[PDB]
Design a protein around this ligand. Structure first.
Ligand SMILES: NC(=O)c1ccc[n+]([C@@H]2O[C@H](COP(=O)([O-])OP(=O)(O)OC[C@H]3O[C@@H](n4cnc5c(N)ncnc54)[C@H](OP(=O)(O)O)[C@@H]3O)[C@@H](O)[C@H]2O)c1
Ligand SMILES: NC(=O)c1ccc[n+]([C@@H]2O[C@H](COP(=O)([O-])OP(=O)(O)OC[C@H]3O[C@@H](n4cnc5c(N)ncnc54)[C@H](OP(=O)(O)O)[C@@H]3O)[C@@H](O)[C@H]2O)c1
Lengths: 426, 426
């Protein structure tokens, strides 16, 4: 229809006031939201809309001449309070949404801006209380999608036992304002260079994600993940899929995601001999945040063996690719801010390099509004990535191997380049 | 065999003392010449080897410790004097070559460092006087290979009436020390991206040759050619061939040159509507040779309509390429020193970019020594390029259209970009 309700499960946290309210503001200001779109937040802290405004207007970049549009925006805003496992609270939320103009028939988009530890509760109550009877119901879940195959499997099974896959939207948007253009141009490259990309012409493919900045006083949150769960298992693996995939049956989201799943189902579990881990130490001669290392961050626990750099070799095992090594190299606190995919050819060796107005996160919100699931990891697709990376992560958490120390600013630990050479790179 | 004689027809000119003596020195110093190689020069001016040495040693970059190798080098040197159409002079040359150690059986490589106006004479006398009876005989001819289809045809017919094609080596080496790597990597790219390069995936191909420097006090020699005869008709057309060619039957020089000829035989004669010509004027705000324009060069005749920039659209007409425009854009005195080939794809539009120890000219001398004709335009291949570009050049010399004036440092006359847009570039 034409009436939409944007439920924000958790308006009192960072992601709410720092981004999603600003981003929805930015889409409304530019006339990109549906004309009949209400924004309804919901958390336990009792507070007025004006409190959200006083504590989240700084981040809007508002200018005096455009503020009347903002007044209409906040007329669209409303907020109610309640618990996350209180049936009466969800009933109050549902009745308040029904009270809005045409809220009975309206589409409902639930953004779970909550720590996944409460998801099991929320997804339940919504399912039995707040789902629309006429319009569609789409839920946006947030990272982490578990931390291993078992936890991710239990969470995804719980969520998919209540919502069809065309209602589950797993969003990921923390690696740059050009995050969607990456996958878009990589899909275009797979559609163009489809016939060339075989084991006959290519000897090795690499996928690189370098960042020049460290954790920057926030290594405490990064310490509970690791560089494998933060960059590799989700994004680099998705672009590996996009590189190695077959020609899709069409341009539907589900067909290309089927091809990505088919690619993932051919990658065996990575083992430690094909893995090089590294941790960045403070640069003695640099200045600024360059002087501090990973362990010099106060939020990082002492003795942390968490890797902030990883080089991993995977192999797609079919007829198109066999023995062709896919080298995923990523790392915080490096020499450049580079995100590229280089395919080296069977012959100095020659290689093809693929380097990178709706801006990423906004593009993603608009995809869930229109309904295109193109860029969201699908539930069965995730299980395969977690299967690939789970034994290695269990081994790392069990044995806790000391990551190779590398100097802040270096390209990486020399063992990574040695690993590349062992498999056949030069 | 093992004995070689390097005849240099014309040791008293620039190309002799500035390059070919230095280059052969550089190949001997590095042990790249055959061990039994004699260097024998020949021109009308009577002079000793020591005069060539006193006037060409500056250009050798000799260092005190390496000069004993140079003494052996000049022991290999010798020189005789005579006319270019005097039978007795060529008889003296032949007897002197026979006098050398094993000179009767030795291979003979004739380098015609002479203005082509005497070629007809030289190539005759050699054919009847100085060709070896046991070893091979290879002649290196030099630009210009004529100036239109008729003159080039008469010259090539005269030369090929005396020497087989595996004896004629048309050398071209004035556009950079990386001139051979260009064609090498372009051949590799054709062998790799063969299946992709069709009219289905590609909408437009461009081939760019930009130079940031002007004529630099030597516009008098450039004025008799034009930018079409200096860059486009020879080099850019060769790399167009290398891009659009089919898969060769093997890796022989003659098979790939057959493919290049097959490509050339499908390009019709270019007409003025697909041509944009430009002449560089002095930059008022720049400094140095930037202040002077093309007409400010004293060696340039007043009122010269010679084009120093050209943008030309050609079309290969077969089944692999049809309606696919090949845009050859070249120009002296520009913004960058760039030599690239960009293939634009059928969709912002995406494009594939191909940009560029034996160093070019040395690599070429070594190819004629070993005998690989890979990088030398073959006699039947040249005729096709001259056929393509002859009507346009006749029209330019007849009507003398004033080239579009463009500012020194600009990308080029706006009419070139307009021409690109007319054919379908964006
Ligand atoms: N790179 C990443 O992976 C990344 C980065 C940023 C955010 N995120 C995800 O984004 C989501 C939003 O989190 P946030 O960082 O923006 O802020 P947040 O403080 O984690 O959560 C926002 C709201 O959640 C409720 N909440 C927090 N902890 C709770 C608990 N233990 N029990 C019940 N309710 C609780 C509170 O609402 P009330 O107290 O008002 O009820 C709080 O204001 C999280 O799921 C987080 O994982 C991920
Ligand atoms: N970009 C280009 O196209 C380019 C650039 C450089 C050179 N070249 C070619 O390289 C070749 C070498 O020429 P160069 O520039 O190095 O010097 P050059 O002075 O043209 O020729 C060298 C020798 O040729 C003889 N010679 C010159 N004009 C003659 C004439 N009208 N009749 C008879 N003999 C004559 C003289 O020998 P003696 O007086 O001792 O007998 C002279 O020392 C030429 O064919 C030229 O076209 C081309």
């Amino acid at each position: 229809s034409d009436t939409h309700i944007f439920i924000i499960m958790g308006a009192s946290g960072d992601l709410a006031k720092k981004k999603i309210y600003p981003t929805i503001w930015w889409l409304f200001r530019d006339g990109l939201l549906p004309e009949n779109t209400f924004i309804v937040g919901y958390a336990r802290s009792r507070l007025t809309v004006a409190d959200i405004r006083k504590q989240s207007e700084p981040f809007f970049k508002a200018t005096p001449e455009e503020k009347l549009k903002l007044e209409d925006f906040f007329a669209r805003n409303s907020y109610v309070a309640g618990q996350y496992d209180d049936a009466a609270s969800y009933q109050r939320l549902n009745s308040h949404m029904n009270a809005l103009h045409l809220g009975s028939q309206a589409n409902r988009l639930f953004y779970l801006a909550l720590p996944p530890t409460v998801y099991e509760a929320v997804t339940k109550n919504i399912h039995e209380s707040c789902m629309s009877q006429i319009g569609w119901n789409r839920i946006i879940v947030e990272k982490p999608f578990g931390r291993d195959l078992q936890s991710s499997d239990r969470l995804s099974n719980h969520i998919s036992s209540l919502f069809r896959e065309d209602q589950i939207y797993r969003i990921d948007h923390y690696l740059g304002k050009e995050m969607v253009q990456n996958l878009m141009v990589l899909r275009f490259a797979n559609r163009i260079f489809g016939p060339i990309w075989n084991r006959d012409n290519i000897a090795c493919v690499i996928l690189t994600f370098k960042e020049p900045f460290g954790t920057e006083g926030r290594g405490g949150y990064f310490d509970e993940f690791g560089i494998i769960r933060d960059v590799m298992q989700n994004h680099l693996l998705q672009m590996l899929c996009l590189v190695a995939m077959e020609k899709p049956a069409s341009t539907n989201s589900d067909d290309v995601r089927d091809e990505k799943v088919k690619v993932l189902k051919c990658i065996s579990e990575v083992q430690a001999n094909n893995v090089v881990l590294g941790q960045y130490v403070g640069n003695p001669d640099g200045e600024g945040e360059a002087t501090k290392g990973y362990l010099d961050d106060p939020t990082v626990p002492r003795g942390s063996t968490t890797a902030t750099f990883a080089a991993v070799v995977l192999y797609v095992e079919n007829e198109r690719w066999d023995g062709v090594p896919f080298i995923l190299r990523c790392g915080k606190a490096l020499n450049e801010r580079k995100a590229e995919v280089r395919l080296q050819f069977h012959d100095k060796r020659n290689e093809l390099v693929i380097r990178v107005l709706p801006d990423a996160y906004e593009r993603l919100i608009l995809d869930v509004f229109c309904g295109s699931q193109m860029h969201f990891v699908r539930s069965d697709e995730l299980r395969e990535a977690w299967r690939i990376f789970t034994p290695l992560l269990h081994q790392i958490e069990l044995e806790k191997p000391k990551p190779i120390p590398y100097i802040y600013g270096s390209r990486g630990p020399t063992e990574a380049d040695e690993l590349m050479k062992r498999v056949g790179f030069q």
